[PDB]
Amino acid sequence: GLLGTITGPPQCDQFLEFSADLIIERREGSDVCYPGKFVNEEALRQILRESGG
């Protein structure tokens, strides 16, 4: 999941310092590994989308 690139759950190990021009979220994406959510999560999603990595 896009937010997982910040915290760093095991699915997001490849993208902890990723750099992109086009970021593609998928449905199967998971921001997390231990049960829990993000606070104000779309706001931060929208930021990382245009972050270039």
Partner: protein
Amino acid sequence: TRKSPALIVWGIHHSVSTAEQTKLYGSGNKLVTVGSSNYQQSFVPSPGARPQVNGLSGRIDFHWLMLNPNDTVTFSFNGAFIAPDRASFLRGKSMGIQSGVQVDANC
């Protein structure tokens, strides 16, 4: 230290049993008071019984904050705190999209 804003991210552990919260961080009330020049907030764990997602009925929720340059973020805590080891920084421009089809590198 850098000249672009910094992404700081922490986490609070809302436990399942109040006993689990004492077992880990010690008994008594827990409090995290994130502070910056722009951001003054405060967070408290909420230990209580929950349906078990992936097993652990505990819950680690994440919060975030944008720290301006030359600015300092101050954490003040006494338990139930997931700590940031590294800050995140943004590299430039990108397009965020959401799809379920392949990626054609040729078109």
